[PDB]
Nucleic acid binder design. Structure first.
Ligand SMILES: [K+]
Ligand SMILES: [Mg+2]
Ligand SMILES: [Mg+2]
Ligand SMILES: [Zn+2]
Ligand SMILES: [Zn+2]
Ligand SMILES: [Zn+2]
Length: 144
RNA sequence: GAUCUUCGGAUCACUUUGGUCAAAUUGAAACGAUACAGAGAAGAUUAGCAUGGCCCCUGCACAAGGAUGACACUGCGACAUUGAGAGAAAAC
């Protein structure tokens, strides 16, 4: 992950996108230090929000705007700059707007069911349209 | 929303919330100190190992320690009364 000045220089397209990745890390540090105003699980939601945003930024760079070479993209996935499994989910139908991977796994629920944000809202009552407890997601359904 | 399909639709995904319990006087324990006595075996000083269980404490412990850890160590009536006398009463 962390890179030293004596390390192998990253591929050619890295320096154009270095500052925004540094800024992502800056907000991650801010979220780490910021404390309070939530339950034991609620305070840990912005972490997943920012992680999804960064991985989505890299995925957008490669697969929709083609602004980076495949070598640099593979390097970024190797250096944990982006979540490989999350992108793998984004690449298949039905999961285009997946929030995180804890809201898809059924072994982490009480009754072996995916999270509430995964249900399309057309099949969901108005009262139970809430923010996900895992990450604060407000609807992952591709339809929505 | 993506994919086809022929503009009828079909696919792809589908119900979260570990809860000694709501932001700490009034539902997570156990006591400081001062004041009283104030250290087992029939004189006196004192080794200990036990017995009993709604007494525990330290310990990983079925070792061992905590004053021999402490408290306790007693005591009574499935006695039948007649053996007799005396004054009374009721009775040989
Ligand atoms: K002694
Ligand atoms: Mg002893
Ligand atoms: Mg004893
Ligand atoms: Zn999620
Ligand atoms: Zn969720
Ligand atoms: Zn979600």
């Amino acid at each position: 992950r962390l890179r030293t000045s004596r390390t192998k220089r990253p591929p050619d397209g890295f320096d154009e996108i270095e500052p925004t990745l540094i800024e992502f890390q800056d907000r991650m540090r801010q979220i780490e230090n910021t404390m309070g105003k939530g339950t034991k699980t609620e305070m840990l939601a912005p972490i997943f929000q920012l992680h999804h945003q960064r991985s989505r930024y890299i995925y957008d760079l490669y697969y929709k705007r083609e602004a980076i070479s495949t070598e640099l993209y593979n390097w970024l996935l190797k250096q944990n700059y982006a979540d490989g499994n999350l992108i793998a989910k984004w690449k298949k139908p039905g999961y285009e707007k997946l929030c995180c991977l804890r809201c898809i796994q059924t072994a982490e629920s009480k009754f072996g069911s995916t999270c509430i944000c995964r249900v399309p809202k057309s099949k969901l009552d108005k009262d139970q349209r809430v923010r996900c407890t895992h990450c604060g997601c407000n609807g992952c359904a591709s339809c929505d």
